[PDB]
């Protein structure tokens, strides 16, 4: 099922919930230890990891270097080693059972830095920095290469994407998206990098485009019904689900589903309550 961790509504949240696309109902599971929004989720060895973010609360706004592990049949969170630096609005991807933490912010600082986590060693190590400073960056893995997509450098919002080659440790710029997107939902379905929604500095977006590696081409597909940035995204059963987000007025509880065979979006559920900036992954 689809797990959503953290988020923001009036304050950063501790929620961990699981959506069942088969039966349509939500399961409520163990709270995060520390509230977090602007984090990312991923899955390694069936375990669910919560990376970076910040605790934005009535009492303080502390960027998080934390990494925490949830076990789906222990229902327990356990802390792992922390990152080199705090990363709010981080992006993460998984290659060869290792987690890559990309970009994000600490206070004023917008990172280009990138580090990698070793689950059987509980260690982080620096790797090559990005060409670009990026927060609200979407991250995807395709053919074991790591793609950093869009985001915000502190002054401009980005349509650029760059590719990380783990066996050469060098970042390379690729073809830019057709749309400037910070806080988009970025994932991989079929064999295309999808970028859904986001904020371009004027308006939240409902457009969606996808990157074909072999032709180095971004093409637009069917747009979502509801504009959103700071959304969660994952693919389940070969279909894209996007979760919550902010539309410039409202914290969304809408969950939309894209079927790639028909190129259509349809609303599948509403979250328990609207929230933005969640970490989403499936197990």
């Amino acid at each position: 099922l689809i797990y959503t961790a953290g988020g923001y509504f009036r304050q950063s949240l501790s929620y961990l919930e699981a959506y069942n696309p088969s039966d349509g109902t939500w399961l409520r599971l163990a709270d995060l230890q520390v509230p977090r929004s602007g984090l990312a989720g991923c899955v390694v060895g069936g375990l669910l990891y919560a990376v970076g973010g910040r605790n934005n609360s009535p009492d303080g706004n502390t960027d998080s270097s934390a990494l925490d592990c949830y076990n789906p049949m222990t229902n327990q969170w356990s802390p792992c080693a922390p990152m080199s630096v705090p990363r709010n609005r981080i992006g993460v991807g998984v290659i060869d059972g290792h987690i890559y933490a990309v970009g994000g912010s600490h206070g004023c600082i917008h990172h280009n830095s990138v580090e990698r986590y070793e689950p059987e060693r509980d260690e982080w190590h620096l790797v090559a920095p990005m060409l670009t400073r990026r927060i609200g960056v979407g991250v995807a893995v395709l053919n074991r290469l790591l793609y950093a997509v869009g985001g915000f450098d502190g002054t401009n919002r980005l349509n650029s994407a760059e590719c990380y080659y783990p066996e050469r440790n060098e970042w390379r710029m690729i073809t830019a998206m057709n749309t400037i997107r910070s806080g988009a939902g970025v994932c991989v379905l079929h064999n295309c990098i999808y970028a859904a929604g986001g904020y371009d500095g004027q308006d939240q977006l409902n457009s969606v485009e996808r990157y074909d590696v072999e032709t180095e081409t971004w093409t637009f597909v069917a747009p979502m019904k509801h504009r959103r940035s700071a959304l969660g995204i994952t693919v389940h059963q070969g279909r894209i689900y996007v979760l919550g987000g902010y539309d410039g007025h409202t914290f969304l509880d809408s969950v939309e589903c894209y079927d790639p065979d028909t190129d259509t979006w349809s609303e599948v559920t509403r979250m328990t309550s609207g929230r933005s900036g969640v970490g989403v992954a499936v197990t």
Partner: peptide, 6 residues
């Protein structure tokens, strides 16, 4: 924040 709502 116009993008996350925070």
């Amino acid at each position: 924040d116009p993008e996350t709502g925070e």
